[PDB]
Design a protein around this motif. Sequence first.
Motif, short mmCIF file in Angstrom:
data_model
loop_
_atom_site.label_atom_id
_atom_site.label_comp_id
_atom_site.label_asym_id
_atom_site.label_seq_id
_atom_site.Cartn_x
_atom_site.Cartn_y
_atom_site.Cartn_z
N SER A 25 0.83 -1.30 -0.06
CA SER A 25 0.02 -0.06 -0.03
C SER A 25 0.68 1.21 -0.02
CB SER A 25 -0.93 -0.07 1.07
OG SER A 25 -1.80 1.23 1.24
N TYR A 26 1.88 1.21 0.82
CA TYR A 26 2.79 2.51 0.73
C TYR A 26 3.62 2.71 -0.52
CZ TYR A 26 5.63 6.30 2.78
OH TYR A 26 6.08 7.21 2.81
N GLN A 28 2.40 1.65 -3.53
CA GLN A 28 1.36 2.23 -4.27
C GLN A 28 1.15 3.90 -4.13
OE1 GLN A 28 -1.98 3.59 -5.94
NE2 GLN A 28 -1.94 3.75 -3.65
N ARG A 29 0.87 4.11 -2.82
CA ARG A 29 0.63 5.54 -2.33
C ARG A 29 1.83 6.48 -2.90
NH1 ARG A 29 0.98 7.63 3.58
NH2 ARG A 29 2.01 9.45 2.81
N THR A 30 3.08 6.01 -2.90
CA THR A 30 4.37 6.90 -3.13
C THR A 30 5.26 6.60 -4.26
OG1 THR A 30 5.75 5.67 -1.38
CG2 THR A 30 4.54 7.41 -0.59
N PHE A 113 3.11 5.95 7.48
CA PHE A 113 2.15 5.58 6.53
C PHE A 113 0.75 6.43 6.94
CE2 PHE A 113 3.21 0.65 6.49
CZ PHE A 113 4.42 1.07 5.86
N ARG A 116 1.28 12.74 5.93
CA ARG A 116 0.86 13.45 4.55
C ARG A 116 1.69 13.47 3.54
NH1 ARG A 116 -2.36 18.33 5.90
NH2 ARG A 116 -4.04 16.72 6.51
N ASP A 118 5.28 11.85 1.82
CA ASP A 118 6.27 10.79 1.58
C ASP A 118 7.39 10.95 2.47
OD1 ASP A 118 7.34 8.32 0.34
OD2 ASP A 118 8.00 9.82 -1.57
N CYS A 134 -3.11 -1.30 7.05
CA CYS A 134 -3.47 -1.07 5.45
C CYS A 134 -5.08 -1.30 5.57
CB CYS A 134 -2.92 -2.18 4.69
SG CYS A 134 -3.23 -3.86 4.97
#
Length: 292
Positions: A25-26, A28-30, A113, A116, A118, A134
Amino acid sequence: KERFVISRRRTGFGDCLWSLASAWSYAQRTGRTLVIDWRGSCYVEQPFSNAFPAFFEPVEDIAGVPVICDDRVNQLSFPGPFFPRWWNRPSIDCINRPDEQIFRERDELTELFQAREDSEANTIVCDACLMWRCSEEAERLIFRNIKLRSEIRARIDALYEEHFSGHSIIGVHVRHADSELALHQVCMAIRKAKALSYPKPVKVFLCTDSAQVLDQVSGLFPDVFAVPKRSAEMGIEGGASALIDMYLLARCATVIRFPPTSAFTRYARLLVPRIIEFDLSNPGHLTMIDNP
Ligand SMILES: Nc1nc2c(ncn2[C@@H]2O[C@H](COP(=O)(O)OP(=O)(O)O)[C@@H](O)[C@H]2O)c(=O)[nH]1
Ligand SMILES: [Cl-]
């Protein structure tokens, strides 16, 4: 420049796969590459061999996140700086890695995580339990987008045809005078489960490490069955039979978790229509949860 999240875990598969879903998930997010590093798994004798390909087929991408999951972990130098900040220390300073440091890193990663912005670190090393860090979609994406090796799938398929097809299966996961009460509790969980209605004839699928628990539950209820038992090969074979049970539990109509804190039955919790367990908050009392 390429940046990374490394998912390290070496314990039971439920924990490894939930934890990977947080790593994913992290990533994906960053906008990072996800590295599955299962070197040192409890299921693989040799310490530098990546266990992921020993049980799963190669994966290069999960829902848009690039994935490295093989022995490349042994040739690539993933770039720093690193997070958590412990991973920037010299290697002689990293021999000592006690539980206090692992738990700090779970907490530090959790903070990161939730943040806000990265991290500026080029490689995030996840080497602590990340269960519950997650979304449930993350977990569902992992299970949908990796695949068990053909040899493990064939056994799941054979067993499915032999016992599951045409029937409604109550799955029972039992981890472990104290044995007298426990046996009694399992029996009451099974009678509750059997009192419910099912579409097809009922059978009871028992997943336990105790020969004595199998034997007794089998003598107290009709149609109980389990997967038959068959150095490094007993490593692999332990992993495989753990996965076979984990995945079959997720095809049951009802699943009894004794106890509900096991990551082993997380996959079943995600997919199965009914979960039965002992409410730890009200100990000794059975509760039933309907899946969304
Ligand atoms: N084959 C098989 N393995 C199981 C089953 N339940 C748990 N395991 C595995 O056996 C170990 C059980 O967990 P436990 O001994 O309580 O310690 P843990 O490492 O904190 O989970 C873990 O590796 C589980 O993933 C099962 O029903 N069948
Ligand atoms: Cl799903």
